[PDB]
Prior knowledge:
It catalyses: Hydrolysis of proteins with broad specificity for peptide bonds, but preference for an amino acid bearing a large hydrophobic side chain at the P2 position. Does not accept Val in P1'. Its EC number is 3.4.22.2. The chain has one domain: Alpha-Beta Complex (Cathepsin B, Chain A), CATH 3.90.70.10. Strands 1, 3, 4, 5, 6 and 7 form a six-stranded mixed sheet that branches. The radius of gyration is 16 Å and the shape is globular. About 25% of the residues lie in helices and about 15% in strands. The longest helix is centred in the first third of the chain and has 18 residues, at about 25-40. By secondary structure, the protein is an alpha+beta fold. α1 (about 25-40) packs across α2 (about 50-55) and α1 crosses α3. A hairpin with a 2-residue loop joins β5 and β6 (about 170-175). The protein has helices at about 25-40, 50-55, 70-75, 120-125, 140, and strands at about 5, 110, 130-135, 150, 160-165, 170-175, 185-190, 205-210.
Amino acid sequence: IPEYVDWRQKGAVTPVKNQGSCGSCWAFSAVVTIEGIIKIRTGNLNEYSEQELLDCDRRSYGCNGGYPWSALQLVAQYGIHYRNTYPYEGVQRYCRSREKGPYAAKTDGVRQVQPYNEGALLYSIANQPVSVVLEAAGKDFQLYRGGIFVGPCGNKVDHAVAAVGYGPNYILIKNSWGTGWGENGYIRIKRGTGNSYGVCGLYTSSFYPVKN
């Protein structure tokens, strides 16, 4: 695998979004991975619907939190609409998939990256964007304005984001807190520290969609 990967440069990453006050990180994270795998397989970059996952994944808890793996399982079984057909409202409402017509895209499955293994995560990122979790509760993470982030932070993961690249000393993450946070909405988190949990617990629970 290469020394530097940035899926933004390959045209596989859409603009940065803002989840607002709703605890819908899990849905945003999952959608970044769908947007990426569809571009990689078909050549087209489209935006897909976070709102539909919020409304329709009844295993998750809407704006009170959820699970990227369940959102990805839902897309493998049912499918997902375009963001413009089912736009983000920031509040959970009723599942409107059927009234909005045929799904726009569908995946074939979900896979978990081996946990607590930096190399396994880099290999996955080299193939496509990946859904990852980290601890975002600490003030240092919240006030991050740029640079390679080393903490402080513990490993009490509470926020789902997406890994879209890496370099020699960092992993590149797309967050869903708008373009004014971090590096135009992104954060570079240090890698290679030998902490098996990863900085801020980054290697705890990572998933990606499968599409043939």
